[PDB]
Design a protein around this motif. Structure first.
Motif, PDB file in Angstrom:
ATOM      1  N   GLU A  12       0.867  -1.189   0.000  1.00  0.00           N
ATOM      2  CA  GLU A  12       0.000   0.000   0.000  1.00  0.00           C
ATOM      3  C   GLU A  12       0.891   1.222   0.000  1.00  0.00           C
ATOM      4  N   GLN A  13       1.926   1.218   0.829  1.00  0.00           N
ATOM      5  CA  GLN A  13       2.915   2.297   0.794  1.00  0.00           C
ATOM      6  C   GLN A  13       3.420   2.548  -0.610  1.00  0.00           C
ATOM      7  N   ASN A  15       2.037   1.804  -3.520  1.00  0.00           N
ATOM      8  CA  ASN A  15       0.968   2.359  -4.359  1.00  0.00           C
ATOM      9  C   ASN A  15       0.719   3.834  -4.154  1.00  0.00           C
ATOM     10  N   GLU A  16       0.702   4.263  -2.903  1.00  0.00           N
ATOM     11  CA  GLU A  16       0.504   5.668  -2.607  1.00  0.00           C
ATOM     12  C   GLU A  16       1.632   6.538  -3.157  1.00  0.00           C
ATOM     13  N   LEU A  59       5.734  11.041   2.348  1.00  0.00           N
ATOM     14  CA  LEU A  59       5.654   9.626   2.035  1.00  0.00           C
ATOM     15  C   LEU A  59       6.969   8.945   2.410  1.00  0.00           C
TER      16      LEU A  59
END
Length: 61
Positions: A12-13, A15-16, A59
């Motif tokens: 998920e990290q 993808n973001e 991020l």
């Protein structure tokens, strides 16, 4: 050609990060390194910009 931006990432990290870069016209690749997690690649030219946005958006989460 393609430099190594982030690594050791969650799915998920990953993808973001790609989403946020896509939103600023930088195309990134997500690379599954199995037990070492995902890494993010860009093209050398985009490195500085990509690093800018990753700082800016703080991020990865």
């Amino acid at each position: 050609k393609d430099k190594d931006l982030l690594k050791g990432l969650d799915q998920e990290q990953a993808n973001e990060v790609i989403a946020v870069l896509q939103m600023h016209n930088i195309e990134a690749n997500k690379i599954d390194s199995g037990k070492l997690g995902y890494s993010i690649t860009v093209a050398e030219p985009d490195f500085t910009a990509a690093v800018y946005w990753i700082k800016t958006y703080q991020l990865p989460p």
